[PDB]
Amino acid sequence: SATANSMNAVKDSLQRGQSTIDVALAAGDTITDLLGKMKEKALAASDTSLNTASF
């Protein structure tokens, strides 16, 4: 019975880990969108016909 009771603390720790990784995943999705936009910025900047202001 003591073991079956300690399983509660086990479950609490697992839910805490789930919430942690969920926050990390939301941050990762935002980072991926930013990374795609910077790839587009560097691509457009690599053009040589650009005047200095747009660059």
Binding site: L43, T48, S49
Partner: protein
């Protein structure tokens, strides 16, 4: 002399029309650069247009 003055004025019109041809401050006709390389792909490989002076 009149024909000479006409021919010289036409030459001046050529150089003016040739210098004035620009877009965003870059130009191909004026001969102020060797080539212009516009983008062609995500990798950054670029279409290259050889410039032609006028």
């Amino acid at each position: 002399n009149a024909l000479k003055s006409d021919f010289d004025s036409l030459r001046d019109q050529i150089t003016k029309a040739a210098s004035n041809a620009k877009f965003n401050g870059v130009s191909i006709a004026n001969g102020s650069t060797a080539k212009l390389t516009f983008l062609a792909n995500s990798d950054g490989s670029g279409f290259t247009v050889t410039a032609k002076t006028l």
